A paper describes a structure:
Syntenin-1, a member of the PDZ domain-containing scaffold protein family, is involved in diverse physiological processes, such as cell adhesion, protein trafficking, and transcription factor activation. Syntenin-1 is an adaptor-like molecule that contains at least four separate structural domains: An N-terminal domain, two tandem PDZ domains (PDZ1 and PDZ2), and a C-terminal region. The diverse biological functions of syntenin-1 arise from its ability to bind the cytoplasmic domains of numerous physiologically relevant signaling and adhesion molecules, including syndecans, neurexins, and ephrin B12131415. The present study provides clear evidence that syntenin-1 negatively regulates syndecan-4 signaling via binding between syndecan-4 and the syntenin-1 PDZ2 domain.
The crystal structures of syntenin-1 with and without a syndecan-4 cytoplasmic domain peptide (corresponding to the C2 region; 4C2) were determined to be 2.8 and 1.9 Å, respectively. Surprisingly, our analysis of the syntenin-1/4C2 complex revealed that syntenin-1 formed a symmetrical pair of dimers, each of which was anchored by a syndecan-4 dimer. Each syndecan-4 bridged two syntenin-1 dimers, forming a unique dimer-of-dimers topology. Our crystal structure analysis of the syntenin-1/4C2 complex showed that a major interaction between syntenin-1 and syndecan-4 originated from hydrophobic forces between syndecan-4 residues, Y201 and A202, and syntenin-1 residues, H210 and V211. Upon syndecan-4 binding, a structural rearrangement of the PDZ2 domain provided a specific binding pocket for the syndecan-4 cytoplasmic domain. Structurally, the C-terminal region of syntenin-1 was found to form a short α-helix (α5), and residues P273, F277, E278, I280, and I281 of α5 were observed to participate in molecular interactions with residues of PDZ1 and PDZ2, thereby stabilizing the syntenin-1/4C2 complex. Moreover, the C-terminal region of syntenin-1 induced a large conformational change that triggered inter-dimeric interactions between the α2 helices of the PDZ1 domains with a salt bridge between D174 and K178. The crystal structure of the syntenin-1/4C2 complex revealed a bona fide architecture in which the syndecan-4 dimer bridges the dimer-of-dimers of syntenin-1.
Author numbering:
A (entry chain C), D (entry chain D): 1 to 8
B (entry chain B): 112 to 184, 188 to 281
C (entry chain A): 112 to 184, 187 to 281
Write the structure that this text describes.
């Protein structure tokens, strides 16, 4: 399963 | 003061499109439909309504607030986003400010990053980015506002507990 | 900016007067001793420490922060002042009353038709300053004295309870 | 018991 997190 | 009076005019259906919630004996904006008069005159999530047509909103219920709106013949005094605070950051030579998020909520701070140098907290929600509202947006689309921004990235944040309470 | 950089000097004992806590991957001031270089530099409860001696505090634990403090040769910290607080200004009525009821420095009621009612003061908030004096750690009785005795304009800074509870 | 509250 994926985290679906985003970074900046 | 962060207080202002906003005058608005109900619409075709007499709606104005707002939803209010009761927090701690205060009345707060929980929803603002876009392209609404309320939308127009600037109300945003987490703004507090001091009075409606001069009547104190203190201790009202969320329904009592709505009922007073559904009964006018509209002026509001509001105090602006009392729960948000502002953080300013500056992108890298890779154009990074150094935090990670999901569903608009800050989840991690990157070592030696602008976000670290500025005290960004985890468990906080993003509300605005460089003057633009972002509550109700998807992460994909918060990302490009981030991604297309200039060097300086000023955002405003709200602690997760009070964000959970207004929704 | 809420941001300032301050330099302090350790006491004859060698300590500066701070206890700090980690909250939300940040470091905040949990106690300041009186007459201690920390107090003298303006540090107050709920202040946020961004860097010590240039080192980012981000992701630190209270323990790590204290250790950095104990082990340094002479100290500089970057502070965001009172990030958890809000300012509400109220004016006493002819009766001399601003409108609210409190216990243990925490607001429990708002009077109807009172400057507090006009200005949207909220329940569950602790009062951290009245008219430029910190009241944190002060007996309700002492808080009252500042209040009755106060000028017609009343300015107080509040913090929500959920946070105040975390800091201590 | 007293509520020990204060008003202003």
């Amino acid at each position: 399963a994926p985290t679906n997190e985003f970074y900046a | 003061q962060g207080i202002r009076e906003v005058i608005l005019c109900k619409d075709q259906d007499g709606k104005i499109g707002l939803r209010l919630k009761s927090v701690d004996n205060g009345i707060f904006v929980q929803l603002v439909q876009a392209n609404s008069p309320a939308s127009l005159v600037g109300l945003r999530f987490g703004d507090q309504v001091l009075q409606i047509n001069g009547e104190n909103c203190a201790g009202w219920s969320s329904d009592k607030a709505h009922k007073v709106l559904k009964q006018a013949f509209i002026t509001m005094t509001i105090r602006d986003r009392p729960f948000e605070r502002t953080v300013t950051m500056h992108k890298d030579s890779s154009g990074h400010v150094g935090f990670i998020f999901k569903s608009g909520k800050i989840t991690s701070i990157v070592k030696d990053s602008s976000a670290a140098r500025n005290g960004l907290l985890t468990d906080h929600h993003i509300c605005e980015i460089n003057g633009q509202n972002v509550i109700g947006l998807k992460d994909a689309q918060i990302a490009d506002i981030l991604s297309t921004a200039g060097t300086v990235v000023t955002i405003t944040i709200m602690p997760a507990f009070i964000f959970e309470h207004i929704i």
